[PDB]
């Protein structure tokens, strides 16, 4: 285990969440966004 970076849902919304060497990425479903993948566009 080295760094999943997706510890603790980070992300909204059933937002997905990838991973990186500094912070992983969220990636908002159709129909969401926000710094979490928050808001619904609708
Ligand atoms: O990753």
Not at 15 to 24: F, R, T, V
């Amino acid at each position: 285990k080295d760094g999943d970076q997706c510890e603790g849902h980070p992300c909204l919304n059933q937002g997905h969440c990838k991973d990186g060497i500094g912070d992983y990425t969220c990636t908002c479903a159709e129909g969401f966004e926000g710094k979490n993948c928050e808001f619904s566009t609708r």
